[PDB]
Symmetry: D2
Subunit: 401 residues, 4 copies
């Protein structure tokens, strides 16, 4: 309540500290939105975000590590400069910023960078505005490039960037406010067929591509209704007067779990290899470098986030049904809420790029950032919540194993 | 020429002996045409043909063996009753008589029985009307049922009925007069798919049938243009509300040689097994009991037959592109000429049944029978022709091996 | 409460009246379960159910109409014999009883007949055990044959059997207790292709069936994930040596609404007609006599039923995702709850036939019948519930239009 | 015979005049073979061939028209400079020279240019070496670019280049010597599908391409065995995460006649439009600018050419089963013999490029050129042959109409 230094007063300070930084946070959003960059090519966004945390007053109070493990990734850390002779809490906030080809930031990833920077700013301000000994906490900001292709979070996982985080937060703009939305696991694959080019002495690799297409097509009747299979024939011949000795298909499969994705992938391999057997061609089946994991929910973290958004005016009920945050949620307890930004346009469409950079979207972005910061304060000052977050994380991890 | 007992005079007697038997040979044709019977069910035709050779005067001069190896097959033999203390010539004439379902004798097999009986009658009469010692010859008539399905000639081959024949003759009515027409090799197959019948827990055997159909369909572009593949989906499900756990296809393949038929059959097996792999079903691939061989030609026998038909007024240029006579031609030198019967209708059509039983067809049938009988006389009295027939048979046999 | 003639006391009497009839209701179940009969062939079940209501004491107090509109359908009615010089309430209870081929009553329809007869018995006993003037109510039992094929309820709808009913009740055994489960709309179709049977002069009707199969197969990627399409190739040729001039497919489509089912059906027609265009065959597309409607829920009726089952010990969370009760729910407000019967077996499986006729299933059947009877008493004595049932019915009807 | 100025002596002079020019004709072949150029890009070959006829002694005795109608086409004409106050004979010889991409002159078109230039040289020398009045003849050489793609002869036909020719000659190197080989008619087509890119709101243009492929594939069973259909999927999608709204196929069809090609093309259009109907996409079907005609034979011209090659030592028994000479043969009586060049390699293969430029091929090229020149002399001095050539041309033209 009104009591001296209550948790309610700290959550207020975090909201006021975000409102005070509304101007430069909006400039951060515009800087990324105006210069859209693709996966692993976000050099300007990396410059903009690293400079942002460097200039945060007092300068160098955020320990910033540019080019952290990836050329466009970065890492910024803050803790209250104090000690007393007992493990500190590590709270992580992620910033995405890569855009889509041709249409710009049609996923509103400029707002994801803004909302992750704002939440970390609000947490520090709430702890800064605390007298007495502040509890041991380290605020960690991680710039994770290449969400839309590659999986920069996975590259960071392989570098050990998430091994010492206790909780991780981010948020993603969408069409409705939901503390959790089902993002599925994904496996990418490239299929190449090789034949030999008098057509009686011919192995038709284009036949193999079409037969593979037919094999998967009739299989759709027996897929679990939650499964997804989409693919194209990238290469289906060059000239009609020569038997195509080469064909190439590119597919990706999605299932709500790693176990179900393995069954779907084996079923697809059977379809690809059957096309080789029927056509006489040889086949190479090459999976992508990284499989995307489904996002594990965290019940305790979820319920605490919803209670904070309710006080803020958020009414609760994604874009791509898979994200590399799923790999993160498998190693660190996290939440990935989606938030409405004042538009009816769909993600990955041109009209969403308009909404992502609009002035109307800034209110919804900064409001959701406030909810993330207050939820982070909840974990800091409620040990029973932190244990409940860990129990929910351990239980969910056993089922998915 | 006019000389006492010339080969020209013997060929005339064979023609006169056939003309004299025109009445009862036509009755033989009508008896089979009027009561059409299917493969291995030709009990009446067997009765009619056995009685025919039994009543040939003097009675029992034809040694007739009814129910020879097959219930509806038979065997009739004649030789001049004389000896002198040096291997005799065995000349075979085949009679087919099985009809087609529904449309009757749309292949004119009633005329095949007539033409084989007439040729053997003409040969005996030409030798009967010879004074002095007649050369050692045995005229053998073989009733071969089930040409249109099963291959009764093959059943007779397995009984050793052709192991002591030197030359074999028959003729088949068609649309044009040709001393030889390309009949191909054939392999029949029945394909059965087995799945398991909540459709996510389903193996769709109907998918396997359709995928097998697609696999063979695109393969048609790479088949040799002389190859043929035809098939049906005999069983493709029973009720739509149950995943079909069983499917059944029936196919036959044709190629001009045994070697090429093996390549086509292996290619088809790959298509059938690929459908099993793509659908998850198991597959049984069951070939027919008998493969049909292509008909080997005999150049010497061919040229001698054409020279005899030319003197008779026949002008030279089939129904099913495969016949069990091909298996016979592989073990005995033979000819299988086709002859026009005064009709434009196609074989295996209702309007050919009309032509096969017409009065107009009797002249063309008895004329071709005359050509067969004279050709048989050529082999009897020209040792240089018999050796040339055997050399052509040995050479053709090596290529097809 | 304990008050003289409370609604709570009437619900108790209905439960006691059902418990008293447990013996003969179980005999009713066994009589139908032991002699399984198919759609429109349920002559014995019709005899058993009509005799049941005739012998209910005092005899002829149930006005029974055998062979009502359908040969195996029936109608039984009861009202308190009294008047006073104001429209009476008509409450309907449905009895299903047709079984499945081969596996018997694998849907537990013997229990559906029992539960509908028991609920109507319990309502009459609760009203019988009421002194003073009883409110004007007519209990109507309708025997609806051919649920699993045909749609006997639709035949009864066309006879006007539901035009004077205010509320209608039934229940269906399943795996879990749910006051409502999504049953979809369904449209059946039979597709026939006609060609012309020298294969160059051939229209292949089997090609049309396979091409239609392929057209629908690739369409599955673009169907709404709630849609369902299942079909078979009933006729795909007779002999491989003749081009198939005829083919036949049987399909059914399911969508959660009539509007969505029309879009799916037009899309399928495009696939069927495209196969005709590609093959050159003509096509006949014949829809089933009756389309099945999706089941409209009724919120007020639903919530009242759940509150009654809770007092009975039922814990709340189908077989065929479509039923002719959906057509009934479109013209009369109704509920179609599913109830667990002590088994893990799935509907339409052999092991569910075991559960449907077991002694263990009688407790769950009679318990759910008690819940139906108490819910019927709620409608009789709560005018605010009846109006709320009608408002929910009118609102739901506008959306589905 | 030996008589003063016999036709036999003129044919000898034509052979001696070709033998004398063997050196510079071989240089002509090497100049084109060493610098392979593609359709309509044969600038160097045009320079080489125009300069060849310009430098033929006496210079400018060949009236050469460079850049004739096409940039790389040309025209050279010679006649004996004399008059007398009765229509002259126009004899045409064609030179091809365009090569194949990547593999060079794998069709030996360098030899086609050489053989057409040599035959025209031999004819002029035979007429030059004639005293007295020479009959009125004009030797016309036409450079026809872009045989392997485009049809430069057709461009020349549209300019009227063949309207005043009486007979036309060329020759094409192959594997065996044949005065005529069946080259078929050809029709090219490009098929484009347009859809609309939430996959439930999607028209899949890749489905249209695959369905079109399946439609044509099953059609192969019913094509006439002389027909040919080959095609590729040039564009079958770009990224798997977007429904392909565009697809592109490229096909060509071949039939032995224009009438049969029209039936095959309509059947293919039905397959392409059916894919549009099944997928919901719109389709554009665009045929090539020029259809290729089948080559009409000329019996009289054929028999005269074979009699000349026999005297030369040629023993008689193509690459692409269609050529733009077929369009020429439809408007001018012509022959297009194929000739062996000392190699077993196949046309359009790398090893044929080796043979085309070898020293071994020069003897066979110059020998066939001698046969063309003598055949041209036959037409000049046998009026009964010229009339027979025209009667055969008129009769063959009526059947193909
Ligand atoms: N198929 C998507 C999946 C995805 C990952 N991140 C965003 N989208 C891709 O191309 O990467
Ligand atoms: N496929 C044909 C082949 C044949 C053999 N004999 C006559 N026809 C069959 O059913 O037997
Ligand atoms: N497809 C099912 C649908 C159904 C209606 N009732 C029960 N099941 C049928 O054959 O009728
Ligand atoms: N399909 C061949 C046909 C052809 C014409 N000339 C030579 N080849 C082409 O691409 O042109
Ligand atoms: Na600011
Ligand atoms: Na007689
Ligand atoms: Na009782
Ligand atoms: Na020279
Ligand atoms: Zn995105
Ligand atoms: Zn995104
Ligand atoms: Zn036949
Ligand atoms: Zn036959
Ligand atoms: Zn059922
Ligand atoms: Zn049921
Ligand atoms: Zn070429
Ligand atoms: Zn060429």
């Amino acid at each position: 309540l009104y009591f001296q230094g209550s948790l309610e007063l700290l959550k207020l300070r975090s909201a006021e500290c975000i409102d005070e930084a509304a101007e430069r946070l909006g400039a951060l959003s515009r800087a990324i939105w105006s210069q859209p960059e693709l996966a692993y090519e976000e050099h300007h966004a990396h410059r903009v975000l690293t400079h942002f945390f460097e200039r945060e007053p007092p300068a160098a109070s955020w320990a910033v590590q540019p080019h952290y493990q990836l050329p466009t990734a970065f890492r910024a850390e803050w803790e209250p400069p104090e000690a007393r002779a007992p493990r500190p809490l590590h709270l992580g906030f992620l910033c995405e910023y890569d855009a889509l080809p041709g249409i710009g930031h049609a996923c509103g990833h400029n707002l994801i960078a803004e909302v992750g920077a704002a939440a970390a700013l609000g947490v520090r301000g709430a702890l800064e505005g605390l007298p007495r000994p502040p509890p041991p906490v380290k605020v960690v900001v991680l710039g994770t490039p290449a969400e839309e292709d590659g999986g920069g979070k996975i590259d960071l996982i392989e570098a050990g960037a998430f091994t010492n985080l206790d909780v991780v937060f981010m948020a993603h703009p969408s069409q409705e406010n939901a503390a959790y939305l089902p993002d599925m696991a994904e496996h990418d694959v490239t299929v190449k067929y090789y034949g030999k080019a008098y057509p009686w002495e011919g192995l038709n690799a284009l036949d193999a591509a079409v037969l593979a297409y037919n094999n998967l097509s009739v299989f759709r009747q027996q897929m679990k209704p939650t499964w997804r299979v989409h693919g194209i024939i990238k290469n289906g011949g060059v000239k009609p007067n020569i038997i195509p000795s080469y064909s190439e298909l590119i597919y990706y499969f999605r299932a709500p779990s790693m176990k179900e994705l393995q069954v779907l992938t084996k079923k697809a391999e059977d379809c690809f290899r059957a096309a080789a057997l029927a056509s006489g061609c040889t086949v190479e089946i090459k999976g992508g470098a990284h499989d995307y994991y489904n996002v594990l929910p965290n019940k305790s973290l979820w319920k605490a986030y919803m209670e904070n958004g309710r006080k803020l005016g958020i009414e609760f009920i994604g874009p791509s049904g898979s994200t590399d945050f799923g790999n993160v949620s498998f190693v660190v307890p996290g939440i990935h809420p989606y938030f409405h930004i004042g538009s009816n346009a769909l993600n990955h469409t041109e009209q969403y790029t308009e909404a992502a950079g609009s002035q109307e979207a800034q209110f919804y972005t900064l409001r959701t950032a406030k909810a993330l910061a207050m939820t982070a304060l909840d974990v800091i000052f409620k040990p029973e919540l932190l244990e409940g977050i860990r129990e929910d994380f351990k239980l969910k991890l056993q089922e998915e194993q």
